[PDB]
Design an enzyme around this catalytic site. Structure first.
Site, PDB file in Angstrom:
ATOM      1  N   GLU A 100      26.447   4.617  -2.812  1.00 36.64           N
ATOM      2  CA  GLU A 100      26.746   5.884  -2.155  1.00 36.64           C
ATOM      3  C   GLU A 100      25.974   6.045  -0.850  1.00 36.64           C
ATOM      4  OE1 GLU A 100      26.635   9.029  -5.035  1.00 36.64           O
ATOM      5  OE2 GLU A 100      27.076  10.570  -3.535  1.00 36.64           O
ATOM      6  N   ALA A 133      -0.082 -14.617   6.787  1.00 38.25           N
ATOM      7  CA  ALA A 133       0.791 -15.039   7.875  1.00 38.25           C
ATOM      8  C   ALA A 133       0.164 -14.845   9.248  1.00 38.25           C
ATOM      9  CB  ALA A 133       2.120 -14.282   7.812  1.00 38.25           C
ATOM     10  N   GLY A 180       3.042 -10.178   9.997  1.00 35.57           N
ATOM     11  CA  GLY A 180       3.625 -11.500   9.845  1.00 35.57           C
ATOM     12  C   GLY A 180       4.317 -11.672   8.506  1.00 35.57           C
ATOM     13  N   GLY A 190       5.228  -9.090   6.496  1.00 33.27           N
ATOM     14  CA  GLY A 190       6.285  -8.094   6.426  1.00 33.27           C
ATOM     15  C   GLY A 190       7.552  -8.504   7.154  1.00 33.27           C
ATOM     16  N   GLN A 238       0.813  -1.212   0.000  1.00 40.70           N
ATOM     17  CA  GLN A 238       0.000   0.000   0.000  1.00 40.70           C
ATOM     18  C   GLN A 238       0.848   1.266   0.000  1.00 40.70           C
ATOM     19  OE1 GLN A 238      -3.078   0.153   2.946  1.00 40.70           O
ATOM     20  NE2 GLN A 238      -4.410  -1.266   1.826  1.00 40.70           N
ATOM     21  N   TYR A 279      -4.840   5.412   6.857  1.00 37.05           N
ATOM     22  CA  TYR A 279      -3.622   4.889   6.250  1.00 37.05           C
ATOM     23  C   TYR A 279      -3.230   5.692   5.016  1.00 37.05           C
ATOM     24  CZ  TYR A 279      -3.318   0.821   9.294  1.00 37.05           C
ATOM     25  OH  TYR A 279      -3.161  -0.009  10.381  1.00 37.05           O
ATOM     26  N   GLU A 315      -1.738 -13.005   0.523  1.00 36.75           N
ATOM     27  CA  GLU A 315      -3.180 -12.830   0.619  1.00 36.75           C
ATOM     28  C   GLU A 315      -3.646 -11.872  -0.470  1.00 36.75           C
ATOM     29  OE1 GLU A 315      -3.964 -10.285   3.739  1.00 36.75           O
ATOM     30  OE2 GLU A 315      -5.995  -9.796   3.067  1.00 36.75           O
ATOM     31  N   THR A 318      -2.159  -3.355  14.923  1.00 39.83           N
ATOM     32  CA  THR A 318      -3.179  -4.376  14.741  1.00 39.83           C
ATOM     33  C   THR A 318      -2.945  -5.622  15.585  1.00 39.83           C
ATOM     34  OG1 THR A 318      -2.170  -5.654  12.943  1.00 39.83           O
ATOM     35  CG2 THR A 318      -3.218  -3.561  12.365  1.00 39.83           C
TER      36      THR A 318
HETATM   37  N1  LIG Z   1       2.196   3.614   7.457  1.00 37.93           N
HETATM   38  C1  LIG Z   1       1.551   2.510   7.093  1.00 37.93           C
HETATM   39  N2  LIG Z   1       1.520   1.427   7.948  1.00 37.93           N
HETATM   40  C2  LIG Z   1       0.867   0.297   7.590  1.00 37.93           C
HETATM   41  C3  LIG Z   1       0.223   0.212   6.362  1.00 37.93           C
HETATM   42  N3  LIG Z   1      -0.340  -1.012   6.273  1.00 37.93           N
HETATM   43  C4  LIG Z   1      -0.064  -1.699   7.406  1.00 37.93           C
HETATM   44  N4  LIG Z   1       0.676  -0.899   8.236  1.00 37.93           N
HETATM   45  C5  LIG Z   1       1.202  -1.248   9.567  1.00 37.93           C
HETATM   46  O1  LIG Z   1       1.921  -2.461   9.474  1.00 37.93           O
HETATM   47  C6  LIG Z   1       1.721  -3.264  10.622  1.00 37.93           C
HETATM   48  C7  LIG Z   1       1.474  -4.709  10.210  1.00 37.93           C
HETATM   49  O2  LIG Z   1       0.419  -4.747   9.278  1.00 37.93           O
HETATM   50  P1  LIG Z   1       0.624  -5.348   7.797  1.00 37.93           P
HETATM   51  O3  LIG Z   1       1.875  -4.787   7.166  1.00 37.93           O
HETATM   52  O4  LIG Z   1      -0.583  -5.006   6.965  1.00 37.93           O
HETATM   53  O5  LIG Z   1       0.758  -6.949   7.933  1.00 37.93           O
HETATM   54  P2  LIG Z   1       1.178  -7.808   6.630  1.00 37.93           P
HETATM   55  O6  LIG Z   1       2.579  -7.427   6.217  1.00 37.93           O
HETATM   56  O7  LIG Z   1       0.228  -7.581   5.479  1.00 37.93           O
HETATM   57  O8  LIG Z   1       1.175  -9.352   7.091  1.00 37.93           O
HETATM   58  P3  LIG Z   1      -0.188 -10.211   7.157  1.00 37.93           P
HETATM   59  O9  LIG Z   1      -1.385  -9.322   6.917  1.00 37.93           O
HETATM   60  O10 LIG Z   1      -0.287 -10.822   8.535  1.00 37.93           O
HETATM   61  O11 LIG Z   1      -0.157 -11.295   6.104  1.00 37.93           O
HETATM   62  C8  LIG Z   1       0.534  -2.682  11.374  1.00 37.93           C
HETATM   63  O12 LIG Z   1       0.962  -2.254  12.646  1.00 37.93           O
HETATM   64  C9  LIG Z   1       0.078  -1.493  10.557  1.00 37.93           C
HETATM   65  O13 LIG Z   1      -0.086  -0.365  11.384  1.00 37.93           O
HETATM   66  C10 LIG Z   1       0.248   1.298   5.495  1.00 37.93           C
HETATM   67  O14 LIG Z   1      -0.321   1.236   4.406  1.00 37.93           O
HETATM   68  N5  LIG Z   1       0.916   2.448   5.868  1.00 37.93           N
HETATM   69 MG   LIG Z   2      -2.363  -8.204   5.405  1.00 35.58          MG
END
Ligand SMILES: Nc1nc2c(ncn2[C@@H]2O[C@H](COP(=O)(O)OP(=O)(O)OP(=O)(O)O)[C@@H](O)[C@H]2O)c(=O)[nH]1
Ligand SMILES: [Mg+2]
Ligand SMILES: Nc1nc2c(ncn2[C@@H]2O[C@H](COP(=O)(O)OP(=O)(O)O)[C@@H](O)[C@H]2O)c(=O)[nH]1
Ligand SMILES: [Mg+2]
Lengths: 424, 423, 155, 494
Positions: free
Chosen positions: B245, B90, B135, B137, B14, B215, B62, B170
């Protein structure tokens, strides 16, 4: 993580089960014939979760229950194949449901479970409703759980189990049946909502001022709680979206997954209060032990994790404030060593009848009070060895009772350990 | 000269949308891929039919998020083979992202990366976008980083991590996931820009004037600051013209490779001077990671100006801060502020709450005060791991319990590494 | 590690590739295993341009190693008169001691570097300084038969 | 770097010698065809005489560990080796002035001496070197001859008479040799011959011919010697002797008359066991078990076909929904396998094996007790016939419980593994190909309790087949999982 397969077993299982389908069919805009007459996209956004027609399997050794469901309001919608029923009943014998008679039928049930899972894009897990003091809902249900656990080990197992109380049935073998069933659930399920008939009576009697509550009166409190906790699953939402993520953020220790549910406001069968509650009022139905579906005092223990679900149009700003408030103003009641353990989520679609509502799922160590009650009743019965020839005759060993007794006491001790734990 | 971007988890995916939305506006590229108008082909490739395709891979365990990517406004921009999705996520579990679920798709993902690297002649390295607490990430990225250090070992890899914050958090286990990926991705990352979601939240509430940011609000703000760092690679500037660099200028220690980024100005859509914006780079309120650089020693510091800027105004603003503030440096540093300028104006999104500013600056500074951020995670981690809370979930998905301790010791050792430099 | 390539260069004496590694921000005072900075190594093997390059970029002129040896110790040992005066001009420790109790004056006298001995002396070297065994620089000339050194020590 | 062992540059041969030395310590013990420094022993004969003293010493210590990697059977080809190797070893290894180059050459000869049946063939080859120009060679090679004796000695020597003459012949010239060391080290060799059969023999044959001062010192040396005329025990044994000693250090009640149970069966049995009512089936099994099987203690081997009865015990153990009927059936199956040993060759063993492995899925303690105990019965009487292959198959199975239980099964069996023969059993034919590749699938499982069973089932494997042979997949494993595997290796026996 999309579809969920539902199961209902035993008399109570199919009673509160059908009540649940009545509630969420309305909320999603489905009629008894199985046709959409809603007026919103949020209704069909995640209809694929519970529907295809419900993804529900109906089970009981008692064949009469068949007709009590189909002759109900939404009884026409369930698939005829998914009815799987035995010839005779279990008669409050956990062993008959788990080892002898309930075991003979469980294969026929697994065949239908397979059928429904086969045509699923991506299964999440399963969902069982049942009573613990019975013979079928407890004995065959826990047997079904283990049998699925081993055939579908990559999936979630989520149960809605109702606890027996002398106030609702004077059958004295219920402490046996419930203890044996808890010995199973602690090992076989990821999350379990503890519905206490003791607390359902105490709410209909004292708060709702009904001198003689019926099953329907207690079942009204249950079906509304179920739609509340499953709100996240059935509508679009960021937090606690699927079964696994919920259990991940609710269960810190595998055995301690017995949630004390509670919700607000408490209404009677089709009464309207004429006055909609405010956000701070809803929030102050959390510690309010007269709103807990389990007969326990949260003041007497500590919260490990909490999930709050606010339904209706309201200020997300005010909800955050009130939840952040009530946490630190009772900071000694929430465990310190789990930071940000309370999680709140909002859904704009309210439940039918109410303008606003709020459900409070909590893993509170006070739940040990509930298991104390069952064990003391079990032990009093077991020390005099009453009615043991029922269970032993069906192939059970006397040793099993001691193990289930000891295993429940270990479960009680564990809750007491983390209650007295310190971060220091 | 080329560079490949990778986006992992909802966060990566995103934020990727926000960045490639912003890249296409800065490069005058259309949503369908056309262009009525090189240095920018570091990021984009070209079709025979005059179409400009990003050098990017999107990954999520997903569909939901990438399905919106695959049908969004920029559906035509990406080749469908670049957007990869699994089915089971995850579930906020590093173990599933790294061990259980990640192994089922890692080979398909590495294969689709080879297809973009085969189109490239002089590939530089990889940009990686992912969350900490997620998870996917945490787990999958750390796995992919391990495997990229094999199949492409002799080149650079840069991280864009989203540091967690209870205001948008989350999951309870986000401290676990952060520590676990930072342990296993430490050796495989050359440089890594953290983004504290709390600071981005604070900034959006104060300077963008939003009660409860979404978001999109946070991603747009973040995408602006990511563009400021990658501007040098996309327009052929003087400073930070290639991925090496970044390590040269900002990383004087392989482990301590976590720069603090500060961005000014963030102007609501409802002009400042060169000196005023440079003073805001040393104001903690405009940092991307919440800490106090006054409590730490600087190992390096770069200033990336862009817009209507006179090179002499910069030198005045530098001398002002070097004389009228006490920015403590380490003794084994050049202690001179590196500078680069790109005269193109900061692009915003049409409709965005962020306003078009005449000039802007993004200060990248490897201060030792960023250790405060690691300390906050380590403490939360310790509270839960003292009781072995939630540990059974991880151990039950192919992970050894020891990995928790091995990660924690690597984080304690890094906290000592930050201390010894600054004394 | 970039601090390890700068030691490799300063030792083997590739004047050009020091500027390359230092332009990449290599640690001027990077320690190897026994605590030897590149200034130590260049002052040992006689690479005058590399010494003056490191010193003006900020090299600890009085850095010691695991055995307490300064670069002025090593320069006076091997006999690099060009480097000795560069170090001293950059504020070197003329009466530095090492783990064996020796000063740079001890080492230049033992190795017969009479031209370096006189430079150290005029920068205020301690002629009466003793080592572990208890011997001065003057005692070394008596013991070693060097009358060219005995006269140069009493000047 | 295989051909780099003879390269022109010295530092390139120096590598290959270290490469080889690392190979002979890290190679498989049974041995790779790559370990072909036996069939062409001219190779190391060349390496030992390397044109560089530093790369020479490294070739000898590679020969040293090679020459102890050969401590495994079968290497009857030690005759060819001593011919090819000890003349280069003596000529230019003992000769050497280098401290370490000499010490390892002697140690090498030690190992070649105990490869042999006796000392004669090694002694007979290193005798000519006593007549060499260089004194320090004859100075040294008389010391080495003297210590192949004091630690080994003359046993299993065909013609000792011919051998004693051949080694006593030069002793007059050696003891009158110019070099002080050649003389001093010759009195030691005389003592070590006296120390085994003197004083009477060598005073007539040898002592007569030496300087009087010399035979005085030899007498003074015999007083200081204490201990019987031939030593009671040797300080070192040969290969064939040590193995015989190790083998030296390391009625059945079944004769009872056999009983017949076919006549015991009732008529209402076949329908009862194949009935729909659970209690019919239970009582059917429970009767023939408590009334018919439990009493007996030996069944009829001769002319009794139980493969009609046993295939209906399988039908219930596999498919019967009543867990109680399963428990009492597996206890019946065990009784048959226990009271009728040596019967379950194939037909019987295989008729119940794959059903039993399917039913380990059962988690009720009493039921897992009975199923596993029955699987132990068929294992102890079907050794590794069909179980080894099929136990692996069900380790790969989808149910978590059958994985942990069928893997525990291999663990149980492996502790009672004592197959006959030196090597090349069914375990080794399929060890790396199948057993290890399957145990790693358990070791790397998603569940901890599953993984933890593999950790034992790998530490019980190393115990059987050498923690060095499996060091290859040990490296590919996590350092974190490694220390769990080793945890069990230290506490596990066979
Ligand atoms: N700044 C920002 N943070 C995000 C965004 N999407 C998720 N997060 C943060 O990332 C953390 C983990 O959420 P996700 O990254 O969506 O988890 P994921 O990587 O999709 O892993 P799974 O959904 O479990 O398969 C959360 O604490 C959110 O606050 C975004 O679009 N922008
Ligand atoms: Mg997700
Ligand atoms: N809340 C609620 N509890 C019930 C209902 N029916 C039975 N119970 C409780 O469940 C227990 C009896 O078990 P039951 O489900 O009837 O037996 P089963 O048919 O074998 O599962 C008693 O403790 C009852 O109080 C019901 O409709 N609602
Ligand atoms: Mg009933």
């Amino acid at each position: 993580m999309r579809e969920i397969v539902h199961i209902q077993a035993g008399q109570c299982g199919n009673q509160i089960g059908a009540k649940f389908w009545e509630v969420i069919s309305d909320e999603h805009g489905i009629d008894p014939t199985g046709s959409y007459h809603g007026d919103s996209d949020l209704q069909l956004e995640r209809i694929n979760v519970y529907y295809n027609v419900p993804r529900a399997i109906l089970v009981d050794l008692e064949p009469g229950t068949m007709d009590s469901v189909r002759s109900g309001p939404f009884g026409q919608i369930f698939r005829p194949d998914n009815f799987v029923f035995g010839q005779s009943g279990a008669g409050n014998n956990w062993a008959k449901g788990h080892y002898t008679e309930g075991a003979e039928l469980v294969d026929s049930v697994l065949d239908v479970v397979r059928k429904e899972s086969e045509s699923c894009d991506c299964l999440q897990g399963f969902q069982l409703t049942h009573s613990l003091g019975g013979g079928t809902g407890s004995g065959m249900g826990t047997l079904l759980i283990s049998k699925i656990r081993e055939e579908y080990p990559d999936r979630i197992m989520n149960t809605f189990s109702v606890v027996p109380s002398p106030k609702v049935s004077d059958t004295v073998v219920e402490p046996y049946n419930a203890t044996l069933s808890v010995h199973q659930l602690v090992e076989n399920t990821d999350e379990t909502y503890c519905i206490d008939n003791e607390a359902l009576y105490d709410i209909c009697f004292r708060t709702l001022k009904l001198t003689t509550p019926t099953y329907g009166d207690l079942n009204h409190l249950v079906s509304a709680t179920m739609s509340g906790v499953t709100t996240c699953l059935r509508f679009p939402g960021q937090l606690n979206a699927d079964l696994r993520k919920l259990a991940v953020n609710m269960v810190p220790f595998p055995r301690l997954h017995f949630f004390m549910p509670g919700f607000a406001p408490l209404t009677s069968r089709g009464s309207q209060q004429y006055r909609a509650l405010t956000v701070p009022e809803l929030t102050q139905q959390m510690f309010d032990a007269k709103n807990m579906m389990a007969a326990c005092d949260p003041r007497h223990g500590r919260y490990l994790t909490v999930a709050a679900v606010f339904r209706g149009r309201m200020s997300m700003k005010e909800v955050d404030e009130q939840m952040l408030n009530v946490q630190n103003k009772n900071s000694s009641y929430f465990v310190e060593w789990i930071p940000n353990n309370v999680k709140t989520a909002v859904c704009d679609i309210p439940p039918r009848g109410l303008k606003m509502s709020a459900t409070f799922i909590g893993n509170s160590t006070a739940i040990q009070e509930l298991f104390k009650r069952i064990s003391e009743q079990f032990t009093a019965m077991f020390r005099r060895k009453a009615f043991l020839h029922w269970y032993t005759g069906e192939g059970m060993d006397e040793m099993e009772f001691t193990e289930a007794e000891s295993n429940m006491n270990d479960l009680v001790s564990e809750y007491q350990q983390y209650q007295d734990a310190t971060a220091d | 000269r080329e560079c490949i971007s990778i986006h992992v988890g909802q966060a990566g995916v995103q934020i990727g949308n926000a960045c490639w939305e912003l890249y296409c506006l800065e490069h005058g590229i259309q949503p369908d891929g056309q262009m009525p108008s090189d240095s920018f082909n570091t990021f984009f490739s070209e079709t025979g039919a005059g179409k400009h395709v990003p050098r990017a891979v999107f990954v999520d365990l997903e569909p939901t998020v990438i399905d919106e990517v695959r049908t969004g406004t920029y559906r035509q921009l990406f080749h469908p083979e670049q957007l990869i999705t699994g089915k089971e996520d995850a579930a906020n579990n590093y173990a599933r992202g790294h061990y259980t679920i990640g192994k089922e798709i890692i080979d398909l993902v590495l294969d689709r990366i080879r297809k973009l690297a085969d189109q490239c002649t002089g590939l530089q390295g990889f940009s990686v976008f992912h969350s900490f607490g997620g998870g996917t990430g945490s787990g999958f990225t750390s796995l992919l980083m391990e495997r990229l250090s094999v199949d492409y070992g002799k080149k650079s890899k840069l991280e864009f991590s989203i540091y967690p914050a209870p205001q948008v958090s989350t999951a309870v286990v986000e401290p676990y996931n952060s520590i676990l990926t930072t342990h296993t991705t430490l050796e495989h990352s050359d440089c890594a820009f953290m983004v504290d979601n709390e600071a981005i939240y604070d900034i959006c509430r104060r300077n963008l004037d939003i009660e409860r940011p979404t978001y999109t609000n946070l991603n747009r703000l973040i995408g602006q600051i990511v563009s400021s760092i990658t501007a040098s690679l996309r327009f052929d500037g003087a400073l930070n013209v290639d991925l090496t660099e970044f390590q040269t200028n900002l990383v004087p220690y392989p482990r301590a490779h976590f720069p603090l980024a500060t961005y000014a100005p963030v102007i609501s859509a409802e002009q400042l001077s060169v000196a005023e914006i440079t003073n805001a780079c040393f104001e903690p309120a405009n940092q991307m990671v919440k800490c106090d650089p006054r409590h730490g020693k600087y190992m390096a510091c770069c200033l990336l100006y862009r817009g209507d800027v006179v090179p002499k105004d910069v030198n005045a603003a530098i001398a002002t801060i070097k004389t009228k503030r006490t920015i403590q440096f380490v003794d084994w540093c050049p202690t001179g502020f590196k500078v680069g300028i790109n005269y193109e104006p900061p692009t915003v999104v049409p409709g965005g709450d962020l306003a078009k500013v005449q000039r802007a600056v993004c200060m990248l500074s490897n201060t030792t005060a960023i250790a405060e951020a690691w300390a906050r995670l380590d403490h939360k981690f310790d509270l839960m791991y003292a009781k072995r809370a939630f540990v059974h979930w991880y151990v039950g998905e192919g992970m050894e319990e020891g990995e928790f301790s091995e990660a924690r010791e690597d984080m304690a050792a890094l906290e000592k590494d930050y201390e010894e430099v600054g004394v | 590690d970039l601090g390890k390539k700068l030691l490799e260069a300063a030792r083997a004496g590739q004047d050009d590739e020091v500027r390359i590694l230092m332009a990449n921000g290599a640690d001027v005072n990077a320690t190897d295993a026994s605590g030897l900075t590149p200034l130590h190594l260049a002052a040992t093997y006689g690479h005058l341009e590399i010494v003056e390059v490191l010193l003006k970029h900020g090299a600890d002129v009085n850095a010691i190693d695991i055995m307490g040896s300064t670069p002025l110790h090593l320069a006076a040992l091997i006999g690099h008169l060009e480097i000795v005066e560069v170090l001293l001009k950059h504020g070197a420790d003329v009466n530095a001691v090492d783990t064996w109790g020796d000063t740079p004056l001890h080492l230049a006298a033992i190795m017969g570097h009479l031209e370096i001995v006189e430079v150290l002396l005029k920068h205020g070297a301690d002629v009466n300084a003793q080592d572990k065994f208890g011997k001065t620089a003057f005692d070394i000339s008596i013991d070693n038969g060097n009358e060219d050194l005995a006269e140069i020590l009493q000047k | 770097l295989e051909q780099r062992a003879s390269h022109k540059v010295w530092k390139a041969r120096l590598n290959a010698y270290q490469e080889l030395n690392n190979l002979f310590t890290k190679s498989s013990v049974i041995p790779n065809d790559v370990a072909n420094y036996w069939l062409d022993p001219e190779l190391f004969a060349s390496y030992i005489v390397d044109s560089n003293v530093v790369a020479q010493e490294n070739a000898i210590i590679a020969l040293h560990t090679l020459l102890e990697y050969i401590s495994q059977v079968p290497n009857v080809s030690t005759s060819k080796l001593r011919l090819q190797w000890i003349p280069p070893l003596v000529e230019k290894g003992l000769s050497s002035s280098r401290a370490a180059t000499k010490a390892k050459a002697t140690d090498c000869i030690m190992l070649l001496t105990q490869s042999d049946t006796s000392i004669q063939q090694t002694v007979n080859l290193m005798l000519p070197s006593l007549s060499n120009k260089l004194p320090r060679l004859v100075s040294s090679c008389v010391k080495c001859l003297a210590t192949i004796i004091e630690e080994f000695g003359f046993i299993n020597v065909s013609d000792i008479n011919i051998l004693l003459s051949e080694i006593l012949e030069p002793l007059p010239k050696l003891s009158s040799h110019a070099d002080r060391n050649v003389r001093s080290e010759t009195m030691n060799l005389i003592l070590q011959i006296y120390k085994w059969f003197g004083k009477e023999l060598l005073q007539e044959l040898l002592l007569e011919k030496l300087k009087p001062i010399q035979q005085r010192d030899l007498s003074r040396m015999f007083e200081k010697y204490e201990g019987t005329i031939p030593p009671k025990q040797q300080p070192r044994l040969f290969q064939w002797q040590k193995e015989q000693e190790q083998e030296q250090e390391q009625d059945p009640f079944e004769l009872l008359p056999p009983s017949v149970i076919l006549d015991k069966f009732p008529a209402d049995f076949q329908t009862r066991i194949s009935s729909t009512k659970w209690k019919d089936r239970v009582e059917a099994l429970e009767e023939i078990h408590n009334n018919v099987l439990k009493p007996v203690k030996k069944l009829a081997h001769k002319n009794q076909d139980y493969s009609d009865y046993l295939r209906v015990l399988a039908n219930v153990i596999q498919k019967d929904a009543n867990v109680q009927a399963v428990t009492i059936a597996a206890n019946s199956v065990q009784l048959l396998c226990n009271s009728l040993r040596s019967n379950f060759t194939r037909s019987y063993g295989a008729i119940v094996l794959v059903p039993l492995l399917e039913r380990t899925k059962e988690k009720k303690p009493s039921v897992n007790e009975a199923i596993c105990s029955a699987l132990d019965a068929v294992a102890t009487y079907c050794g590794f016939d069909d179980c080894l292959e099929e136990t692996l198959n069900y380790m790969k199975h989808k149910t978590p419980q059958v994985r942990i239980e069928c893997t525990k099964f291999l663990t149980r069996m492996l502790q009672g593994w004592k197959s006959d023969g030196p090597l090349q059993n069914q375990l080794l034919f399929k060890l790396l190909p199948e057993v290890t590749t399957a145990v790693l699938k358990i070791v790397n499982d998603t569940q901890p309790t599953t993984r933890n069973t593999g950790f034992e089932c790998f530490a019980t494997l190393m115990k059987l087949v050498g923690e060095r042979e499996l060091a290859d997949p040990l490296e590919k494993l996590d350092n974190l999982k490694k220390k769990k595997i080793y945890e069990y290796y230290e506490k596990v026996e066979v």
